[PDB]
Amino acid sequence: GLFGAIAGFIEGGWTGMIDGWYGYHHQNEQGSGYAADQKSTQNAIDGITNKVNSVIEKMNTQFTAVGKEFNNLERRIENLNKKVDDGFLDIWTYNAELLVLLENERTLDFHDSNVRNLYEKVKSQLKNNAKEIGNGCFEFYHKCDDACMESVRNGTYDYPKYSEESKLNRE
Amino acid sequence: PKVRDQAGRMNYYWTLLEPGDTITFEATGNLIAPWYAFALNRGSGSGIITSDAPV
Ligand SMILES: *[C@@H]1O[C@H](CO)[C@@H](O)[C@H](O)[C@H]1NC(C)=O
Numbered sequence: 001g002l003f004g005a006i007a008g009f010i011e012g013g014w015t016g017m018i019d020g021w022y023g024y025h026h027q028n029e030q031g032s033g034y035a036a037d038q039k040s041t042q043n044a045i046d047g048i049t050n051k052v053n054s055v056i057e058k059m060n061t062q063f064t065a066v067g068k069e070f071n072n073l074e075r076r077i078e079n080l081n082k083k084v085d086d087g088f089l090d091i092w093t094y095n096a097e098l099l100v101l102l103e104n105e106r107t108l109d110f111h112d113s114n115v116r117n118l119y120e121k122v123k124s125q126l127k128n129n130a131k132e133i134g135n136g137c138f139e140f141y142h143k144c145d146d147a148c149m150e151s152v153r154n155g156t157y158d159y160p161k162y163s164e165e166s167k168l169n170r171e
Numbered sequence: 172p173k174v175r176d177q178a179g180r181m182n183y184y185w186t187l188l189e190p191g192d193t194i195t196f197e198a199t200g201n202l203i204a205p206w207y208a209f210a211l212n213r214g215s216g217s218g219i220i221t222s223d224a225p226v
Pocket residue numbers: 147148150151152154155156
């Protein structure tokens with residue numbers, strides 16, 4: 001993908017996280033588990049829902065609209081009618097197929113972006129108190145219990161609190 | 172030539188008579204006279220389709 005994460009440096013998805021599009025898996029002394037990142041998931045859901053709704057919404061309804069009939073000395077106007085209907089059919093078929101193609105690409109790319117940005121967000125919180133594995137995972141140089149983990153997940157991680165300890169294990 | 176046994180022909184004509192107006196028929200032959208007519212209320216954007224599907 002454009003942003004290199006999904007089907008990228010993170011090879012695959014997690015069938016074990018059923019409650020969100022994006023999130024975290026942790027393992028520590030207290031136990032192990034998945035937790036969805038609520039904010040990014042909900043932002044993406046709202047965005048994509050707005051996209052679909054906006055595609056559907058722009059088709060102001062067709063009010064009652066019908067085919068025309070013609071007598072045997074009206075072939076030219078009948079053909080004008082057919083030219084109009086066929087022409088509109090060409091335009092709407094091309095536009096619908098191509099639009100769906102391009103927007104599908106954009107949606108997938110949007111997800112890839114959201115994953116990369118969540119990863120870099122966590123990365124920028126943790127800095128050198130953890131080492132990047134490379135597969136989307138971070139390994140702590142300090143003990144990080146459940147409260148600490150949740151602090152990481154909600155962006156309230158306290159770097160100075162664990163910096164000295166981290167520095168101790170890193171060296 | 173004959174169609175449905177008849178070498179004669181009949182032409183059919185119609186008109187919409189507006190409210191309050193009068194239509195007058197005069198003839199010395201050949202008139203197929205109105206017997207029943209239809210008073211109409213108008214409405215837009217419909218049309219006719221051909222289908223064998225059940226209503
Ligand atoms: C995030 O989690 C930490 C640790 O439990 C907590 O202290 C903090 O209040 C939480 N912040 C939010 C956004 O609720």
